[PDB]
Amino acid sequence: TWIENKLY
Amino acid sequence: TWIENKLYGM
Amino acid sequence: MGSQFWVTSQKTEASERCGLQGSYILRVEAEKLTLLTLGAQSQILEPLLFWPYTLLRRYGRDKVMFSFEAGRRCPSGPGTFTFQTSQGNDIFQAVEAAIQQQKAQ
Amino acid sequence: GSQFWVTSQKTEASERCGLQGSYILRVEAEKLTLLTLGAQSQILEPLLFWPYTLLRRYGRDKVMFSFEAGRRCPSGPGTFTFQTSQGNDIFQAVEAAIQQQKA
């Protein structure tokens, strides 16, 4: 399912 | 060639 | 957005009213058909006409063209638009596919 | 960008944003936009935007696509869950779009 968005 | 579009008017 | 096709306008009353003349891009999207043309030359583009699917009465095709009849709520006004093209069928499967998905909502 | 029809699955952020039913979730160059049909017009009209730079995280399975918008988003933070069978395709489209920010 998820991945933390590094472009944040 | 043709078909009536049931989605017409919805 | 959706599939795009290089088509040529074939005269009908509706296309004359809207001033259609030669070749255009016809693209099938999620909720409508859009007619695009190419500005001067960079072969740059922008939207000319929108035919929302809930405003398309019917449509058909063959090895020579793809056609459709717009309802009277269209910016185009009601009537038939015929575009000579050798991919009428692909255009028809793209349109039919997109409306069945829109209807499944 | 590319468009997907989806169905709003209740969350606190979705409920405050008045969301419910079907929509088009569009994966564009630099953002995610949620669209609906114009009552008059009958074409897609933007409802909400979520720049990639303001999403905390996003995920997907064979039943949905969801994302967690951070505070600076017009909608407020929270999880936005959308029922769909194409989550992986939306995941992969956002993946690439964010990837192209190699500019």
Side-chain angles (χ1 to χ4, degrees):
Chain A
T1 36
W2 304 72
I3 83 170
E4 356 66 80
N5 181 24
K6 251 48 200 178
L7 196 68
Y8 188 61
Chain B
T1 17
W2 298 68
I3 67 91
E4 252 63 300
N5 179 34
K6 277 48 235 57
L7 205 261
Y8 191 75
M10 314 210 267
Chain C
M1 309 306 91
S3 312
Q4 279 195 171
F5 303 88
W6 186 241
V7 300
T8 309
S9 186
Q10 201 176 83
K11 177 197 181 176
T12 47
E13 187 194 304
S15 69
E16 291 223 302
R17 169 173 73 223
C18 295
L20 306 197
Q21 304 110 1
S23 305
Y24 290 87
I25 271 174
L26 176 64
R27 79 153 66 109
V28 0
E29 303 174 37
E31 27 49 293
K32 60 185 186 297
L33 269 191
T34 295
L35 199 79
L36 302 117
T37 181
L38 299 176
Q41 127 91 153
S42 159
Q43 308 139 88
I44 31 159
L45 94 322
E46 353 68 16
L48 236 55
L49 287 170
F50 290 149
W51 288 281
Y53 296 148
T54 51
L55 268 44
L56 259 24
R57 288 173 181 139
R58 56 176 69 75
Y59 50 106
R61 77 317 185 180
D62 60 41
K63 300 217 184 181
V64 166
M65 49 80 167
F66 176 76
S67 292
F68 66 95
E69 190 186 332
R72 84 204 106 159
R73 208 192 176 305
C74 287
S76 75
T80 294
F81 295 84
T82 295
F83 289 101
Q84 81 186 184
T85 179
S86 58
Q87 306 159 96
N89 314 69
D90 294 358
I91 296 176
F92 187 96
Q93 278 155 43
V95 170
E96 182 168 45
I99 307 177
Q100 287 167 309
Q101 296 185 41
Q102 192 184 330
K103 72 139 185 78
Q105 313 297 300
Chain D
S2 69
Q3 304 181 303
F4 306 91
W5 283 104
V6 293
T7 308
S8 185
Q9 186 159 98
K10 197 196 191 293
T11 56
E12 175 186 319
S14 80
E15 167 152 290
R16 66 146 168 284
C17 283
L19 296 193
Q20 75 181 289
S22 269
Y23 299 94
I24 275 297
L25 184 57
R26 166 183 297 165
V27 172
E28 308 179 74
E30 302 173 305
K31 59 189 192 308
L32 268 187
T33 156
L34 191 74
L35 302 105
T36 197
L37 283 190
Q40 303 195 94
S41 77
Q42 295 297 287
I43 90 294
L44 257 16
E45 313 210 305
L47 216 52
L48 290 163
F49 295 85
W50 295 276
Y52 296 154
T53 57
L54 300 184
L55 292 175
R56 293 164 182 170
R57 43 174 74 65
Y58 53 97
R60 79 307 180 186
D61 50 27
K62 308 195 168 80
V63 145
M64 46 100 285
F65 181 79
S66 68
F67 61 84
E68 179 189 14
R71 289 166 309 196
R72 305 171 299 172
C73 294
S75 65
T79 298
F80 281 103
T81 289
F82 296 99
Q83 287 167 30
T84 169
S85 60
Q86 299 163 301
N88 200 230
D89 292 315
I90 292 173
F91 174 87
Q92 280 185 63
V94 164
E95 191 72 334
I98 294 191
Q99 159 98 178
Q100 285 307 149
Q101 309 283 321
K102 300 200 81 47

